[PDB]
A paper describes a structure:
The TRAPP complexes are nucleotide exchange factors that play essential roles in membrane traffic and autophagy. TRAPPII activates Rab11, and TRAPPIII activates Rab1, with the two complexes sharing a core of small subunits that affect nucleotide exchange but being distinguished by specific large subunits that are essential for activity in vivo. We report a cryo‐EM structure of the entire Drosophila TRAPPIII complex. The TRAPPIII‐specific subunits TRAPPC8 and TRAPPC11 hold the catalytic core like a pair of tongs, with TRAPPC12 and TRAPPC13 positioned at the joint between them.
To assign the eight small subunits within the core, we used the crystal structures that have been obtained for several of these subunits from mammals, either singly or in subcomplexes comprising up to four subunits. These were used to model the seven Drosophila core subunits which were then built into the density map. As expected, TRAPPC1 and TRAPPC4, which form the catalytic site to activate Rab1, are at the centre of the rod, flanked on either side by a TRAPPC3 subunit (C3a and C3b). TRAPPC1 and TRAPPC4 share a longin domain fold, with TRAPPC4 also having a PDZ‐like domain that protrudes from one side. TRAPPC5 and TRAPPC2 bind one TRAPPC3 (C3b), and TRAPPC6 and TRAPPC2L bind the other (C3a). In the octameric assembly, the greatest divergence is between TRAPPC5 and TRAPPC6. TRAPPC5 contains a disordered N‐terminal region and an extra C‐terminal α‐helix that is not present in TRAPPC6.
Author numbering:
A (entry chain F): 31 to 194
B (entry chain D): 1 to 219
C (entry chain C): 1 to 145
D (entry chain B): 2 to 152
E (entry chain A): 10 to 174
F (entry chain G): 10 to 178
G (entry chain H): 1 to 138
H (entry chain E): 1 to 139
Write the structure that this text describes.
Amino acid sequence: SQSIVALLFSEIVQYSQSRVFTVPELQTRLHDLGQDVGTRIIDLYFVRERSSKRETKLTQMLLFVKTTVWKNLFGKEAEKLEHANDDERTYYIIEKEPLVNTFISVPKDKGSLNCANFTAGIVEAVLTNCGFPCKVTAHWHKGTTYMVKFEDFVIARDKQMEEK
Amino acid sequence: MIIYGVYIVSKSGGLIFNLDNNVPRIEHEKTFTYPLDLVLDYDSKKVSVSFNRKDGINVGHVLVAVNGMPVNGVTLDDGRDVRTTLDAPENYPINLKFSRPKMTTNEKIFLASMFYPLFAIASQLSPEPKSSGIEILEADTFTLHCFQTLTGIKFIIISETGLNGIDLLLRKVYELYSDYVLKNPFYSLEMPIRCELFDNKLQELLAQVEKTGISNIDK
Amino acid sequence: MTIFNLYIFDKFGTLLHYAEWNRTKKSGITREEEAKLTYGMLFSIKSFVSKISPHDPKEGFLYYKTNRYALHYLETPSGLKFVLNTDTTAINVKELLQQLYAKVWVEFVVRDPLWTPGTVVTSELFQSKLDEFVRQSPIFGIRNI
Amino acid sequence: SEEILFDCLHAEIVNYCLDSNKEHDLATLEYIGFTTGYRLIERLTREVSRFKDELETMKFICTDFWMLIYKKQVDNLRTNNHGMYVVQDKAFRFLTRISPGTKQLEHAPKFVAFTCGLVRGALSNLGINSTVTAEVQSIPACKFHIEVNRN
Amino acid sequence: AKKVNSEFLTLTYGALVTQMLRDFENAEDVNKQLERIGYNMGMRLIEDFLARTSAPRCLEMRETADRIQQAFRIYLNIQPTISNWSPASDEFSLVFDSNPLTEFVELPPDLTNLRYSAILSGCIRGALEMVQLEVQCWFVQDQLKGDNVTELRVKFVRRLEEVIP
Amino acid sequence: AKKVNSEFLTLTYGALVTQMLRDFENAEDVNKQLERIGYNMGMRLIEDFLARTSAPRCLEMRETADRIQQAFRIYLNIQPTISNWSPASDEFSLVFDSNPLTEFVELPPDLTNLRYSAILSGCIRGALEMVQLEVQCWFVQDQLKGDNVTELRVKFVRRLEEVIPAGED
Amino acid sequence: MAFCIAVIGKDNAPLYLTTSDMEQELELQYHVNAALDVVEEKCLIGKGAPESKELYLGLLYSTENHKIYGFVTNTRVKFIVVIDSSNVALRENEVRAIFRNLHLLYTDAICNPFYIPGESLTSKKFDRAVQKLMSGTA
Amino acid sequence: MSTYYFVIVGQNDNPIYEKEFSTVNKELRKEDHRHLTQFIAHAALDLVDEHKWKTANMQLKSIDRFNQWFVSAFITASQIRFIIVHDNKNDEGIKNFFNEMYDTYIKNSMNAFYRINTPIKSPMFEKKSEIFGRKYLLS
């Protein structure tokens, strides 16, 4: 079903709002929960979709996550995965479908960020357990996008591997 | 054809959501002469007409702005009274601008508050037994469909007299109500609806119901 | 069209007359307070339809329908109020109530010297005329529009 | 039709209930009214003879008047052993407006007084010679016995 | 034959005015009591008039004049020429070439102030307070007073509205 | 397409339970607030359960039992079984076969006082609130606790509605 | 030519007008004409003239160059005129019409309630209508 | 025979859970060897980092040597390290034996109570470890 998950998740969000007295670390709680779910989402979806195969290439693993996590979680794989050439540590994954607004959400006057942050935390946990620790920020740029910021160590290991 | 005002009220009955469709209230104009056939009877800051209806003018129809001077209460914006200009014949002929008093937000809130117990107490001791409250009201120019979800929510939408199948529209707004209340438990079950998502999806519903055909139930 | 019951109230708001043929649920409160509750019912309905209507109410309110019964209304320009009540299936009863008003109530209330406006209407002759007139085409139902 | 004007106007005829006269209306209404009815009678099936007398029963003029006015003829029309007689109707037009319960009898005789004291004729049963009283035993069943003013 | 059903009211009303006169010598008594009884009369007939015509109501003045001339047309069978319109048009004159309430009673009622249209006043007045029109009435001209033609003048004041339901 | 995975919702709920237990050490409060949110869901959930079937409120309590029974097949895609009615024949027992939120989610024996999935036991509560039929409802055997198949005991208490739909309130 | 238009009650002369085709009768015939009319009416009534049908009686009397017509209403009212001739150009159908109209005016004055029956026809409006009937016949 | 011994190295490099699969002897010396093998878990950790950057597959056959022991390393998508110390190798079966303990560890993963590098406490996983070890390694 959809109503059960959409609601029940909404009570996670608002009960955090109960235990939280402000916007930003409310969003931090949403991130932490996204992490705590992705921390197993990762290696569940590993076997059943990746055929139990590891992708050392950041591009390939990131693209495959983009397909898989969205295909099974919210059906539609995210529209586009892009790498910014100015900052190789910072890439983007734009998902025009808002997973927060699947359950049409609160006015963003009293607040800014939403379940977008929760799925961003999912992405961040997937990255950090795939051996690619990263910072994933939900951004209302061109609709819903997740900016991913790679550790200079991780992107450096990548660049060294990208020396064929 | 359009659904004039889609509303909803809590158990207490406070109008939760004043979803107004685009409803062009009729504006009338006329360049009048020396003191008027129109009944320029003053009634509590509402300089309106009760008797002597001409040219599609109703009882509610109230002067808005002579020659584009909006009325504050009873006075001119420049500060003269309506009757102050009424006694003055030099400016005549002068252009009066009449509109029916458009129901503001608080007006509609009071209207729903005063209405609610009507439906709630609707012939509680009715001649037929085991009956319900008012399910459908039909009026001279509109028909109100009220649908209780067997407790709590009352979907109240007013459509055209000849319109048919409004119950399905109530079904769809029930669906979209659920699709909204998905998100905010801090949105109390009796807080007014303030969310643009419901607004835009209902604008899509209005665009649909511009077309009579409701199929795969149309949203 | 056989119906549940009919109510007649003066513009002031008193119970001019009540008639019953099919009213099944017999209330516990008195039919006097019941009549006043119906009159408040009707007047507040008239206000509601007058004000929330986007277009000019010529005759205002028409009727309401419920799950199990339906109620129909008639405003005279005199201010007199008729209300009928029944089940669902019939011709629209606006002209039915108008025919009843013109042919019976005008015939057998106003024309009576004993009838003094501002009082109740108590006469077995009018009770008869009303009864057989509803029994003129008396199958059932309303579905008024 | 042009009945409700007279019905109401007669209701007010009753309405003024001054404590002086049992006749809210005098026989003047009578005289002028059947004088108009006589205007209606420009023909009557009575012979032209100056040497012979033919009588036009007040009963017949009464019934034709009534169709013109009350719109329901006699049900019983009995000729008393005198020159006088009695008329009996199961229902009366003004009385159709009220139930048959005996509550206010006294109005109906004032109603039907419109046929009392009519400007007479010489011969017996000559059309208009009328002295009559109302003796109503039942509310729709209105009865009226005439008395010969002479003799 | 027997076309005109109603020449009996011109003499019934004549009996009314004569006996009111013989009861009270004052010329204005037979005017005011006669007006109030014609007022109750108008109450009693406006109901049937709206029963037939099914007019919505007299929310406007011209439509009110139309309804009133229609009422005169249906019962009293006279055509009220609606004329003499005020610049504010709150009032209009009813032109009756032939009085319907009478048919040639006589030009002198032996004495003045004998208002011969008081029922007519009720006829025009009563209906108004039943169709919810707090209206004043008065007669500007009476052909029966030695004049050519009878004109009435009726001035709406306040829209009677129901209160405290 | 059911637009969800049983595992996915299971992960979200288990993480939330972890969250409360990290918040309040005492399982009493986590039970309280979990039933609170069960009440919270159950009030809106009935707004969709009645968006498909327009069943009359309650002709009889077996109607309520079948309604709540079909509800879980609508949402959690599991068919519960209704049985074990009193001689009073108002109460009943209800069997949940498989719980998507449960599926291989163990519980700490140092946390036994917790009623893990009682949200459903509260959802019906929140559901039964709405139709004006409050209910004393809870479990008598828990597949979570080590029982064979899940079994919740429904004691209806009292009504809140008259011959009118508006009812006492 | 002269006509005397007369309505008659039981015994008196309520309204008699002595007019001509030119004006009122200047001749001092008033009393003689009134007496002749009353005697003729009484004798004819004693004979049978009291009858139900509206009674036509042409040339029921014949004075010096004045021939009389009597008419009877079932309401016991009589009507008289004369023609100033033993012979003059006129008709009798015109007499029928004019006394039918005379009855019409009679009952229309009877409409006037201030007029108690059995009185002189006082109203100059009614009387000018009567002399207009005169002009209709002379 | 091989003194099989399994050890977990967590995401944050801290050790988690061991499981012997050796014959019964020298247990007091086996305590010192357990310290040794936790140190070997760290040494594996270090080497298998770059060695798994060399490859992209699940199993890295055997890396470190100490003149009697063999060190076999398993890397997951969970970037956990599952390590066996053993005198003579049995790799051919342990590839999918690691796959099966992987699946069981996934089962623990759905248990949200078990969390990131949160040390094993469930009896379920302990009895799974016992039955699996008696299956292939401890045998």
